[PDB]
Amino acid sequence: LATLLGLIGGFAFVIMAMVLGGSIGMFVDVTSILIVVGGSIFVVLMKFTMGQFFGATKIAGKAFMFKADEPEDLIAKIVEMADAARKGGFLALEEMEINNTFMQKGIDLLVDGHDADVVRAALKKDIALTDERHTQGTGVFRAFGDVAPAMGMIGTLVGLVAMLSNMDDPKAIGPAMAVALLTTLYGAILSNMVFFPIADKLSLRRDQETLNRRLIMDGVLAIQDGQNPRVIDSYLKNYLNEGKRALEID
Amino acid sequence: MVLGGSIGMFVDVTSILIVVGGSIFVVLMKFTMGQFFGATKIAGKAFMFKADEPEDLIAKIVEMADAARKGGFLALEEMEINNTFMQKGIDLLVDGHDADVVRAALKKDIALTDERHTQGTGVFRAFGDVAPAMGMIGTLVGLVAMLSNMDDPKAIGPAMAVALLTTLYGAILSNMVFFPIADKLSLRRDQETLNRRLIMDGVLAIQDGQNPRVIDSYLKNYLNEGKRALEID
Amino acid sequence: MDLATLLGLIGGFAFVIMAMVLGGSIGMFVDVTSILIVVGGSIFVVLMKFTMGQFFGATKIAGKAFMFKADEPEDLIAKIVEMADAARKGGFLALEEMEINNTFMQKGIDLLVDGHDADVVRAALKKDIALTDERHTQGTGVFRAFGDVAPAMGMIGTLVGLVAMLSNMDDPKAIGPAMAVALLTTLYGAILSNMVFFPIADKLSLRRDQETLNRRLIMDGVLAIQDGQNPRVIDSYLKNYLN
Amino acid sequence: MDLATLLGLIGGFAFVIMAMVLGGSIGMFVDVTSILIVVGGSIFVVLMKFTMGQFFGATKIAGKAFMFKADEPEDLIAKIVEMADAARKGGFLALEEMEINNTFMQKGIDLLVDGHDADVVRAALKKDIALTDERHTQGTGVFRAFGDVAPAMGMIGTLVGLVAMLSNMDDPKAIGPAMAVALLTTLYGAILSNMVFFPIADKLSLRRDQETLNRRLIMDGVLAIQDGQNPRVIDSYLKNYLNEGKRALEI
Amino acid sequence: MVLGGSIGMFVDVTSILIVVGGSIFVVLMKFTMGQFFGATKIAGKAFMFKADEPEDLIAKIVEMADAARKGGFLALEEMEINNTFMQKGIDLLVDGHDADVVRAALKKDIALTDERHTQGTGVFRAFGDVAPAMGMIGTLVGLVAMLSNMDDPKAIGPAMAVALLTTLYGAILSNMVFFPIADKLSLRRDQETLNRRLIMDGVLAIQDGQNPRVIDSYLKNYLNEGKRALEID
Amino acid sequence: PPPGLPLWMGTFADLMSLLMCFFVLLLSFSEMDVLKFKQIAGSMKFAFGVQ
Amino acid sequence: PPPGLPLWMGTFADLMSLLMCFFVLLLSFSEMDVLKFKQIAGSMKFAFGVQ
Known part of the structure; x- marks a missing residue:
């Protein structure tokens, strides 16, 4: 993702412009x-x-290394199986090539032969399942972000009492105190630039995946109904004007 | 700032x-x-263009309705239009489309604009939330750098500059830049809802053939509630 | 407000002022900039x-919440059952001879006597109650915004003053007074935030709650007046709605 | 007085002795300003x-909560059932021949024996319960406001003390005591908030819960006596209400 | 409190x-x-014990489902149940009572357990809120003591030690014991509520003379709500 | 969610960090008396379990 | 409910207070060096763009 490249560039620039005054060893500590x-x-x-x-x-790893399927390629695919069903029924759906697990599961339930209610229930259960999974990941990382600064200050206090146990020289209090405060700095950085951002990106991926899944269940319901692709075009692109993708358009 | 000194005394790349x-x-x-x-x-469009006065929209809705009644349903394409949304309303009415389809188009445009304004408010309120946190982080980094280099004044100086100006920048961007922009977008969103509501209702009344005497009275029913109630008694 | 309340407010302000006086000169803590x-x-x-x-x-x-007190509820119930009795022993014309105690009740009874339906009168009172509630909410928002931004402005001013102080030291013995003056901005921001703006916002929200209850009681009372119902039932119904 | 307030008093005394021992004397933790x-x-x-x-x-x-211990609900139930037996076998006139330690129950008993009907009796008792609840809620709100504002006032006073110390700061090596005096205001705000005002508000909340429970038991008992129900049935009713009215944390 | 070298550093009675x-x-x-x-x-019961796993709960409930399907409401007495809530439910089943009263009793019991756990969570959240505040009281007392006796070295040490250790204990107790204990109580509340909802649904499904396998499907429906389904992949 | 802590505590912490910066400054251009720093250092070791 | 600041903000202010008062204690027995003061002031006027 271009956002990941921007992340790498920002990481590098921030580190380089922070560690310029002295050496990198003051702000780097594995302990x-x-x-x-x-x-x-x-x-x-x-x-x-x-x-x-x-x-x-x-x-979180899936949300970062991978990228959610675009809700435009999705339109191409849905209208593609709409044409396939109109030309040769549901018997033409299985030989097609699909790279999305959710449409594949939907059509594999469709081929067996089932009415609207059971397939709709299964699809809504799966959408709610994936939404809840992303929601619990956001909760986990919100908890991580909430507790990281507290642990950093506890570490700072422990370092300070360790520093107050090792005196006799006016010149070690400064470096020792700096090393003690490094833990609080790491707690703040992990809270604000990793855990809360990871939770936010998890919520963003939740929104993208939920939008894609509503698009897919509606597409499968329309194909099962046997509707032509024309009115289908409007009734599925109208969902593309919600969220943030309707902000980015001008 | 200018009385304390200069703008040059607040500059630091770090x-x-x-x-x-x-x-x-x-x-x-x-x-x-x-x-x-x-x-x-x-945000730039909200800052470089004032929202249209609701009174001007009601009056102008009445003039197009008068013109339509004098010259049929195709009489509104010869005089200037202010904004693009009403222009789209006019060029859909000129096509003789039924009420339901034009209503759907106007409701999609209102919802899209509402989503854009709400999302802009969310982005800038996120910016204003994260800026002071970064200022505190900058204070911590500068404190660590100061304590690490208490023997070197050439390092003491820049470290404190980072510590102070990170907090100053976080506070200024959060409370004087980002949150004010988010508030202006929320106000502009409320103004968009009022103007868009007035215009779609005006288009609905013109399409229905209602006489303008009732239409103006009906549109005036909207302006008498809103955020401007601190000026009213 | 009550003379006791004003006396207590003046006493607390006086205590703060003297405590400021005993810690040295008061012109030391005064800076126009x-x-x-x-x-x-x-x-x-x-x-x-x-x-x-x-x-x-x-x-x-906010100013009219410091010089006028919300009417006590029992007086409102007593007055509404008083015009209930007046209507029963008289008519709708008997309410005009009753002199002014509350503007909301007065305009309600005026809209009531000039010959309007129960539903339209109810609608007018509902718009007025909602209008007053939203006015109080916007005032609370204004003062909450002031109390939220005042510490922020105090901190911007302290940092700007401190940057100005670090820009030209030239003297080690002058550092302290400069930082004292710079911190004065934070002191004023904190005082305005926590002693002026947030207290008035909280008071206005509280006045919003009592005023909403009181205006609901008046609207129910006048609606009961238009029904021509039994005044004892009105008293029982209003007292039940109190609890 | 309960165990909590005794613990608070002894803890405050231990806090004072700790402070004086740590600081040698006590006059530096006391500042009039x-x-x-x-x-x-x-x-x-x-x-x-x-x-x-x-x-x-x-x-x-608050003074009434910290000076008079609330009556235990079982004692009230025993009292309601004994006067109930007395009225069952002695009529309403037998209710003025035994002592009453509760002013609200005494008011209800006089109102009951003076011939007032159930409607007015219920209205007056409900008005009394609502007045007590409103008084307790208002007190809790006042002390909550004190707890909210005391540390803000302490931070304002510490800002005042820091401005005073730095303004009078030449060659800083005697600024210790002045800095301590500046911190005293925030120490006072913290102690008043955490150890006085919020504890008083919480004890007022607990006393509100106790008095609501007690008053509901007494109004139910008095209304049962007004209709002259059997003492055993109303005894059973009160026992069911107390065990369900008790929280889940102590059952 | 181990990274200092031992435990003897982090101990003061004051x-x-x-x-x-x-x-x-x-x-x-x-x-x-x-x-x-x-x-x-x-809290001790939640930490030292473990709530019964829902899988075993569904297995046992369908076991008595088949038992009731082969012998009606009389076979349930003769098998062993290690869970208190299902045993009370089956007892209320075999004592000849209708669905309404047993449903009311089970609803009362679930709400009682939920309220008990909620109040325990509230108690430990109050503890975790007050502990840092006490740390703040101790920091101010120790710092006042330190600044007052700067000229007394033998008084400087203990005052600063109390000030620092009060803060360390308040932070550790708030963020690593009391808030974690409250969070564990909330987790046990959610798990316990899920288990009790499974059991009440099983009891209502056994009264309803219904097939055990559709019963099994309704109970499997409950295994994908909460944090468990996040683990489920 | 829990209501959180009031804004005055945040102002107090920002002010505290500013005062840290400026007290670090005063100790930056200063020469600590080595003799007077070891009685206090011995006292902190004594009061912290080391001695 | 209107939000506030996180619950660790009190511990952060605590830590800020403790460290500030440790520095006032260290500053209590530290004598000022005027040459170092001039050097740090020059570096200060260099780091703020004031030459």
């Missing part, structure tokens, strides 16, 4: 980041099990 | 980078670059 | 959410 | 929102 | 007393002693 991340995982794990946290992590 | 770049990064992590440009476009 | 920065910036920022008419309306509605 | 700022600003702000009469009513209800 | 005792005082003013002790018991 501080380890303290913050370990304490935050432990706290969230008291309220989420290992499986639900790994699920949230894997959904 | 502080500007921290606050603005971090805010942009956070917002782009939940918004697309093109949608953010669209929000900037709508 | 800082108060101009805070007040002018707050007005400038708030004017990007409210027009001058809206700001003056909020000022007026 | 800081106390004046916090108390005067809190009263000032609270009086912008409540009347002086309301402030006195809140103070009185 | 800080522990001020923080824990102040928090305890505030909580007993907010809540009665019975509520506080009940909250402690429910």
Whole structure:
């Protein structure tokens, strides 16, 4: 994603312009980041099990490395199987090539032979399932963002009491105090630029996937009804003027 | 500022980078670059163009209705039109389309504009929420850099400059730039709803053939409730 | 307000002022530039959410909440059952001879006696109650915005003053007084936020709640008046709605 | 007095002894300007929102909560059933021959024996319960406002103290005590908020719950006596209401 | 409190007393002693025990479903149930009562458990809110003590130690014990409510003389709501 | 969601960090008495479990 | 309900207060060095674009 390239560029520029005054070793510490991340995982794990946290992590991974199918390529595909059914019925749907799991599941339920109610119930259950899955991932990362600064300040306090146990020199208090504050800095950065942004991007991917899934169930319901692609064109592009994609258009 | 000194005393590449770049990064992590440009476009249009006076719209709706009644349903294409949405209404009425289809088109346009304004308000309120957080982060970075380099004044100076100006920039952008822009977009959204409601109802009355004497009275029923109630008694 | 309440307010202000006096000179804590920065910036920022008419309306509605007290509910029930008895022993024309206690009730009975239907009178009172409620909500919003931005303006002014102080040191013994003056802006912003704007906003919200209850009671009372119902039932119904 | 208030008093005494031992003396935790700022600003702000009469009513209800322990509900039920037996086997006139420690129940009993019908009796008892609930809610609101404003006033006073210390700061190596005096105002705000006003508001909430439960039991009992129901049936009714009226945390 | 080198650094009786005792005082003013002790018991039960897994619940319910389908409402007595709520439900089934009364009783019991867990969560959230506030009281007391006796070195140490350790204990107790305990209580509330809804649905489905397999489908419908379905892939 | 903490606490923390910066400045151009810093250092070690 | 600041903001202000007062304590026994003051002031006027 171009947003990911912008993320990499911003990361590099921010680091380079932060570490310019002195050396990178003052703002880099594996112990501080380890303290913050370990304490935050432990706290969230008291309220989420290992499986639900790994699920949230894997959904975040899917939301970052991969990209949701565009709701325009989706239109091309839906009108394609609309033409296929109009020329040769539902018997032409299976040999087609589909790269989206949800339309494939819908049509594989359609081929067997089922009326509108059962297929609609199955599709709505799947849409609600994926929406809830993304919602729990956003909840996990909101919890991570809420607890990361608290763990960073606890780490800072522990570092400060460790510093107050190691004195006798006017010159070590400054570097020691800086290393102690590094934990709070890492907690703030992880809260504001990782965990809350990851939760926000998870909510964004939830919105994109929910919009795509309503588009797909409506497309499959129209194809099962056997409607022609004309009125279908309008009744599916009208859903493309909601959310943020209707903001980006001019 | 100008009495304290100059604008030159608030300039730092590191502080500007921290606050603005971090805010942009956070917002782009939940918004697309093109949608953010669209929000900037709508903010610029809200700032460079005042919303049309509701009284002017009611009066002008009455004049087109008079013209239509004098010269049939095709008499509104010879004199100037102010905005593009009513222009679209006019060029759909000139096509002799039925009431339901034009009503659907106008309701889609109102909903689209409402979504654009609400989304612009959301983007800029996100910007205003993240800017002071970045200012606090900048204060923390500058404090760490100061404490790490207390023996070097050449490092003490820039570190405190980062710490102070990150907070100053976060506060200024949040409370004087980003939140004010979001508030202006919310106000402009309310104005759009009032003008669009007045015009679609006017088009509906013209299409229905209602005499303009009742139409003006009906449209006046809208202007007497809204945010302007602090001026009314 | 009550003389006891005004005396207590003046006493608290006096206590704060003397406590300021005992900590040294009071001209040490006075700076015209800082108060101009805070007040002018707050007005400038708030004017990007409210027009001058809206700001003056909020000022007026906050001012009339300090010199007029919301009418106590029992007096309203007593008065409404009084005109209930008046209508039963007399007619609708007997209400005109009753002198002015509340503007809302007066305009309601005036719209009631000039010959209008029950539903239209109910609608007029409903619009007026909603109008007053939204007026109070906008005033609360104005003062909440002032209380939210005043600390922000205090912090911008302290940072600007401190940057000006760091721009030319030239003297180590002059650092402290400069920082004191710069912090004066934060002190004024905090005082205006937490002692003036948020208290009036909270008071106006509270006055919104009592006024909504009171106006609901008056509207129910006048609607009962138009029914020509039994006044004892009105008293019982209103007392039940109180609890 | 309950265990909570005794614990608070002993904890405050231990806090004072700890402070004096830590600081050697006690006169540096006492500053007239800081106390004046916090108390005067809190009263000032609270009086912008409540009347002086309301402030006195809140103070009185708090004093009554901290001086008179609420009656235990079982004792009230025992009293209602014994006078119920007395009225069942002695009529209404037998109700003026035994002592009553409760002013609200005494008012209900006189109102019951003076021949008033059920409608007026219920209306008056409901009015009394609503007045007590409104008094307690208003007191809770007043003390909540005090707890909300006291630390804000403390931060204002600490700003005043910092301005005073820095304005009088030449060659900073004697600024310790002045900085401590500046912090005293926020210390006062924190102590008044966390240890006085919010605890008083919470105890007023608990007393509101207790008095609502107690008053509902007594009104139900008095109305049952007005109709002369059997003492055992009304006894059963009160037991069911108390066990369902009890929360889930203690069952 | 281990990264300092040992535990002996992070121990002061004064800080522990001020923080824990102040928090305890505030909580007993907010809540009665019975509520506080009940909250402690429910937290201990939620941590040391585990709610019955819904899978086993559906298996057992369909087991008695088939048992009732082969022998009507009389076979249920002769098998063992390790769960208290389903046993009370089946007892209310076999004692010859109608669906309405048993449904009312089960609804009352579910609401009672939900309210008990909610109040325990409230108690521990009050603890986690007050603990940092007590840390703030201790920080100010210790800092006042420190600034007052700057000329007394033997008084400087303990005052700063109390000030720092009060804050450390308040932060640790609030964010790593009390708020986590409240969150665990909320998690157990959601899980427990789901399990009890499964059991009430199973009981109503067994009364309804209905096939066990459609019963199984309705119960499997409940396994994809909440945090469990996030784990489900 | 929990209501959170009031804005005055945020102002107080921002002011506290500003005062940190300026007190770091005053200690930046200063020469600590080495003799007077070890009695207090010994006292903090004594009061923290080390001694 | 109108939102506020996160619950860790109180601990952050706590930490800011503790550190500030640690620096006033360190500043209590530290003597000013005027040459270092001139150097830091020059670096300060360089870092703020004032030459």
